[PDB]
């Protein structure tokens, strides 16, 4: 069976918790926010995003929630606080794991709070609901076994680990399908091609963005149905600008911490990606998957 893209993932997310601390919001949510109201700060928007997702799971207290690619815990920690469920978080980052583990010590609840350095490929317990925010772009990747063919194992797996009322909220960056790209009038100048290369080179090695039809094909092949396609990628512009701005604001702390080049790399990364979503070149979609 499958090998998790450990080293690829670690090269990014294990860059330094203090480094990310500088420019992420306070909840350290590392995925597209949700400006449900025009006046939310970034941090309130991250809450709104977490909420928005968790609400779709029809969670009841006592249930077990699996969070795949649980980042820095915000989603788990929020799922317990606001829903009273037990949570299991999957991550491949040592830093993220270290931090979620400690962040758990703080607040208390009769609910289970587990973070693991485990891949979805290796998970094998029964759960009630599933959430994954901004991790999916790594699932087509593997320790030398990459391929969208992997989505197939994925959806069939977690269809089988969940009850008959089982639900999955898959939140992920996407790219337009043939028909829709044409319809958008999308075009790929040389600057853009250089950028993606830069991204796949300096930021997210082995990352693969799905087309909605890919998520359909493999999900339904497993028996899933999409109760909703919530396209919300426009929110990534405010998000990404916020991150970029904060990083710039801490330019001197950041150069002090992980170096000159990295400020440049990440500023370039953050500024650049903003435009991708501005231009509708990329999107973010939240699939509500049911049986």
The residues that are catalytic are 273
Sign (positive or negative) of CA dihedral 56, 60, 66, 67: positive
Q: Does 238 bind ligand D22 (CB under 6 A)?
A: no
Tell the smallest beta-carbon distance from residue 191 to its own copies (Å): 9
Question: Rounded to the nearest whole angstrom, what is the least distance from the CB of residue 109 to ligand D22 in the complex?
Answer: 27
* Residue 52 is assigned to a ligand binding site: no
Residue 208 interacts with its own copies (CB under 8 A): yes or no: yes
Of 118, 65, 64, the closest CA to residue 90 belongs to: 118
210 contacts ligand D22 (rule: CB under 6 A): no
What is the C-alpha to C-alpha distance for residues 232 and 229, in angstroms, rounded to an integer?
9
Q: How far is the CB of 193 from ligand D22 (least distance, A)?
A: 8
Side-chain half-sphere exposure of 67, counting CA atoms within 13 A: 29
Residues in Cβ contact with 47 at an 8 Å cutoff, skipping those fewer than 6 apart: 27, 78
Indicate which single residue of 134, 142, 210, 233 sits in contact with ligand D22 (rule: CB under 6 A).
Answer: 134
**Least distance from ligand D22 to the Cβ atom of residue 37, Å:** 23
Contact partner at residue 187 from its own copies, ligand D22, none, CB < 5 to 8 Å by partner kind: its own copies
In the list 58, 188, 213, 220, the residue contacting its own copies (rule: CB under 8 A) is 188
Interaction between residue 1 and its own copies (CB under 8 A): no
178 binds, among its own copies, ligand D22, none (CB under 5 to 8 A by kind): its own copies
Q: Which of residues 144-203 bind ligand D22 (CB under 6 A)?
A: 173, 199-200
- Please report, to the nearest 10 degrees, the dihedral formed by the alpha carbons of residues 238, 8, 28, 32 taken in order: 30
Write the binding mask 134 to 173 for its own copies: x where contact by CB under 8 A, - elsewhere.
----------------------------------------
Nearest CB to ligand D22, comparing residues 73 and 207? 207
Cβ-proximal residues to 53 (8 Å cutoff; 6+ apart), any chain: 75, 131, 133, 169, 171, 286
Contact 86, 116 (CB under 8 A): no
6 binding partner (options ligand D22, its own copies, none; Cβ < 5 to 8 Å by kind):
none
Q: Sign of the C-alpha dihedral, residues 147, 151, 153, 158? A: positive
Q: Which is nearer to its own copies, 188 or 260 (CB)?
A: 188
- Compare residues 102 and 200 and give the one whose CB is closer to its own copies: 200
Q: Write the binding mask 211 to 230 for its own copies: x where contact by CB under 8 A, - elsewhere.
A: x-------------------
Rounded CA separation 224/162 (Å):
11
Question: Minimum distance between the CB of residue 31 and ligand D22, rounded to whole angstroms?
Answer: 5
Cβ neighbours, 10 Å, residue 78: 20
Instruction: Please state the separation of Cα 18 from the chain's center in Å.
Output: 20
Return the beta strands (E) in 81-224 as ranges. Answer: 86-91, 113-117, 129-133, 167-174
First-residue to last-residue Cα distance in the chain: 25
Binding-site residue set for S-adenosyl-L-methionine: 30-31, 65-73, 91-96, 120-121
Q: Which residues bind its own copies (CB under 8 A)?
A: 175, 178, 181-182, 185-190, 193-194, 196-197, 200-201, 208-211
């Amino acid at each position: 069976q499958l090998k998790p893209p450990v080293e690829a993932v670690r090269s990014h997310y294990d860059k330094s918790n203090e480094f990310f601390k500088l420019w992420l919001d306070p909840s350290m949510t590392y995925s597209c926010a949700y400006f449900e109201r025009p006046d939310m700060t970034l941090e309130e928007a991250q809450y709104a995003k977490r909420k928005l997702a968790l609400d779709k799971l029809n969670l009841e207290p006592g249930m077990t929630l699996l969070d795949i690619g649980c980042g820095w815990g915000s989603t788990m920690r929020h799922a317990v606080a606001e829903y009273d469920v037990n949570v299991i978080g999957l991550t491949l980052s040592e830093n993220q794991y270290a931090h979620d583990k400690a962040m758990f010590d703080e607040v208390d609840s009769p609910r289970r709070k587990e973070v693991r350095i485990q891949g979805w490929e290796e998970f094998d317990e029964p759960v009630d609901r599933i959430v994954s925010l901004g991790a999916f772009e790594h699932f087509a990747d593997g320790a030398g076994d990459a391929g969208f063919e992997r989505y197939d194992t994925f959806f069939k797996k977690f269809y089988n680990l969940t009850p008959d009322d089982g639900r999955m909220l898959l939140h992920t960056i996407t790219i337009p399908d043939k028909e829709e790209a044409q319809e958008l009038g999308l075009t790929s100048p040389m600057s853009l091609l250089r950028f993606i290369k830069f991204i796949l080179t300096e930021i997210f090695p082995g990352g693969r963005l799905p087309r909605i039809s890919q998520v359909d094909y493999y999900s339904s092949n497993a028996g899933w149905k999409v109760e909703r396609y919530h396209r919300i990628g426009a929110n990534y512009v405010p998000t990404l600008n916020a991150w970029a701005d904060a990083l710039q604001a801490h330019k001197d702390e950041a150069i002090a911490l992980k170096g000159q080049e990295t400020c440049d790399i990440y500023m370039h990364y953050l500024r650049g990606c903003s435009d991708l979503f501005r231009d509708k070149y990329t999107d973010v979609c939240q699939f509500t998957l049911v049986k």
